[PDB]
């Protein structure tokens, strides 16, 4: 089976479109701006001319669509500079909508919350401080990063109750770690390798 | 009080939260 897209819907959902790029920021800056969200897997960049004035557009692909979701929900709603960027491609929406709503509802069965903008040193049990002070958690693990050596700036925390999950989301954004406010959301696709057949 | 906008729970959270940041993230001296 050539061309491993593994459900084209999810493949694109993990990759956000960045339009209306400010000016003094490029792939160098955008990488870091969305770094607390998810690890940059690949970038479809449009460098125009040797001048490097990035005349065009860019695509930021993450390892997890949850980071892409937060990039859509928060980054497009909050001006990260003197210019608002357009995240995503409103074209195949509606067609892939039943899939999106399916994934969200399907991952909802695990009622796990998504923790991003996690401080690199601050560890899993540390993030537990805030989450477990509001409600109860059954599983807590920040994804380990092989190239960083410590852990990626995100993780998947699991509440036992859907009420407490919603309580956490409302306050966990404000989680200040050394000057940076955290960023929480939800799991949009089942972040577990429950794929028996590798088709 | 009101949930979602928790007053005590989230302050419990953050006393722990900067405690965890005090060891790793930003040393504030003692605590």
List CB contacts (< 8 A) between B4 and chain A.
166-167, 170-171
Q: How many CB atoms lie within 10 A of CB A41?
A: 13
A17 close to A56: Cβ distance less than 8 angstroms: no
> Is A140 in a helix, a strand, or coil?
strand
Note whether B3 contacts A: Cβ–Cβ < 8 A.
Answer: yes
Q: Exposure string (b/e) for A175-188, b if CB count within 10 Å is 16 or more?
A: bebeeeebbbbbbb
Contact A126 B26 (CB under 8 A): no
- A185 with A142, same domain: the answer is yes
How many domains in chain A? Answer: 2
Contact A176 B14 (CB under 8 A): yes
- A198 with A152, same domain: the answer is yes
Closest CA to A41 of A26, A15, A61, A12: A61
- A135 with A186, same domain: the answer is yes
Which residues, listed in sequence order, are joined to residue B11 by a DSSP beta bridge? none
- A62 with A149, same domain: the answer is no
> Is A199 in a helix, a strand, or coil?
coil
- A123 with A99, same domain: the answer is no
**Looking up tokens 């993230």, which residue turns up?**
B25
CA distance A167 to chain B (A): 4
Report the C-alpha gap between A57 and A32 in whole angstroms. 17
Q: Specify the experimental method.
A: NMR
Report the C-alpha gap between A3 and A59 in whole angstroms. 19
Note whether B28 contacts A: Cβ–Cβ < 8 A.
Answer: no
- A93 with A1, same domain: the answer is yes
Report the C-alpha gap between A186 and A110 in whole angstroms. 11
Contact A129 B19 (CB under 8 A): yes
- A92 with A121, same domain: the answer is no
Report the C-alpha gap between A69 and A50 in whole angstroms. 33
């Amino acid at each position: 089976g050539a061309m491993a897209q593994r459900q084209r819907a999810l493949a694109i959902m993990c990759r956000v479109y960045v339009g209306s790029i400010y000016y003094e920021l490029g792939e160098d800056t955008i990488r870091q701006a969305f770094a607390p969200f998810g690890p940059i897997k690949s970038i479809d960049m449009s460098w125009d001319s040797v001048t490097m004035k990035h005349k065009g557009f860019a695509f930021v692909e993450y390892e997890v669509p949850e980071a892409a979701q937060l990039a859509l929900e928060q980054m497009n709603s909050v001006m990260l500079g003197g210019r608002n960027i357009k995240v995503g491609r409103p074209s195949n929406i509606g067609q892939a909508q039943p899939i999106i709503d399916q994934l969200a509802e399907e991952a909802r069965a695990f009622n796990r919350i998504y923790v991003a903008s996690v401080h690199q040193d601050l560890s899993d049990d540390d993030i537990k401080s805030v989450f477990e002070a509001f409600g109860k958690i059954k599983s807590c693990t920040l994804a380990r990063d092989p190239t960083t050596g410590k852990h990626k700036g995100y993780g998947f925390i699991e509440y036992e109750k859907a009420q407490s999950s919603q309580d956490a989301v409302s306050s966990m954004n404000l989680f200040d770690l050394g000057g940076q406010y955290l960023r929480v959301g939800k799991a949009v696709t089942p972040p577990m390798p429950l794929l028996t057949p590798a088709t | 009080g009101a949930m979602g906008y928790v007053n005590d729970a989230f302050k419990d959270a953050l006393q722990r939260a900067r405690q965890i940041a005090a060891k790793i993230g930003g040393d504030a001296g003692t605590s």
